[PDB]
A paper describes a structure:
Nonribosomal peptide synthetases (NRPSs) are multimodular enzymes that catalyze the biosynthesis of diverse peptides with a wide variety of activities. The incorporation of an acyl into peptidyl backbone is usually implemented by a starter condensation (Cs) domain, normally located at the beginning of the initial NRPS module, via the formation of an amide bond to the α-amino group of the first amino acid residue, a process also known as lipoinitiation. Genome mining of two Cs domain-embedded cryptic NRPS biosynthetic gene clusters, rzmA and holA, in the bacterium P. rhizoxinica HKI 454 resulted in the discovery of two distinct types of lipopeptides, cyclic rhizomide A (1) containing an uncommon acetyl chain (C2) and linear holrhizin A (2) harboring a medium octanoyl (C8) chain. Similar to other C domain structures reported previously, RzmA-Cs adopts a “V-shaped” configuration and consists of two subdomains (N- and C-lobes) each representing the chloramphenicol acetyltransferase (CAT) fold.
To diminish the reaction rate, we made an additional mutation on the second histidine of the “HHxxxDG” motif37 of RzmA-Cs R148A to create the double mutant H140V/R148A, which finally enabled us to obtain several crystals in the absence or presence of substrates. We then solved and analyzed these H140V/R148A structures. The overall structure of unbound H140V/R148A is almost identical to the structures of WT and R148A in both conformations. Thus, the H140V mutation did not completely abolish the condensation activity, correlating well with its role in substrate positioning. Based on these H140V/R148A structures and related functional assays, we propose three potential conformational states (i.e., “unbound-bound-released”) within the lipoinitiation reaction cycle catalyzed by Cs domains. The major conformational changes during this cycle reflect the relative positions of two lobes, in concert with the binding of substrates and release of products.
Author numbering: 7 to 214, 222 to 234, 240 to 333, 337 to 431
Amino acid sequence: STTYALSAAQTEIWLAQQLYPDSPVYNIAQYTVIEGVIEPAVFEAALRQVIDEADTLRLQFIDSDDGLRQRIGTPAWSMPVLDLTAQADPQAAAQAWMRADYQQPVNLTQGPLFCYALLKVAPAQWMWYQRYHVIMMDGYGAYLIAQRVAYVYSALCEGTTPAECDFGSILQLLESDAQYQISAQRAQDEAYWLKHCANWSEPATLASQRLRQTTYLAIQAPDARRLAQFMTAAMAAYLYRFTGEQDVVLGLPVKVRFGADRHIPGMKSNTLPLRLTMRPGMNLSSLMQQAAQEMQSGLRHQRYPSEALRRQLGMQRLFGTTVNVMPFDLDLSFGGYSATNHNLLNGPAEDLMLGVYWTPGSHQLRIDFDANPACYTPEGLGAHQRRFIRFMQVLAADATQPIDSIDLLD
């Protein structure tokens, strides 16, 4: 059958997994606590169908003598049914089993790239364990998969025929990427991004178990694009007021659009570098304006991948801070029983990732700081989060006040 080339990110993932074959961070993991009755045969059938619909789970990454490639195959898989009701702490035992799974490495040539499992933790409490490899999954795709599985399971339980998936096949993305590889548009994107990162020396960073720290707050003073624009400008201004460097680079993940009308689980976002210059006397207004100008001046070349741009200049990162503004993923129901999704692991982390989580019709925000241990300490990340949020609160109260006239914290 037909084989497709891997992306630059997938090739880097392959090479890093071949370098450190015992590192388990290239596995993202998640679990779904379900408060109700779960019968495992219906769930296994739902997984059987969803794995066929989300064909990124049926990809086989093989090695050749003419290039690393991937193919759509029929990978062998299973779903264990673990019962832990007859033990003292079933929560601890289930978490230990999960931790035992996502801590052992995964071989990419011959081996299972995902893992599904069901656990008894209480008489009416089953947890669905979901592990994937970074080479074929991201968090958004995992949530899409979990939602589709919940819907299909609820449909199969009540005997109804589940509706047709709203997923696009990964082969659409593969063909589009193969045609884009030989694009003249890709050549022009490379030209633009190379002329844009011209005099770009090492960027601004606060770099002095991923360090994760959340903080809930509520600003009283729109859309979800003004929100992300404001958070980008605020993070850049904070880096400029802490490091003293006027030319701040941030990472902005965008969802590339090439013609697909559906979501393709497995298709990842492209993190574009955003360059902001801090002139004296500038305020949040002009910073927002220049950030939007940089966004829409580089959105024309959105498809050029981050990794090709990075190693087309000299590989040690294009940016140290990433802004991820997104609403929460709605809770899912399995057959009529509501479920709560819990992240077990991520792994590949930019040195600092800023995650802002908003809710429709609400003033409450959630600020997450996911950083690299070798670059931050729990006290250093906590002090930075406290300093940035108050600095960001001073920004929201007056968009006309200059950045340099704002006082910083401890």
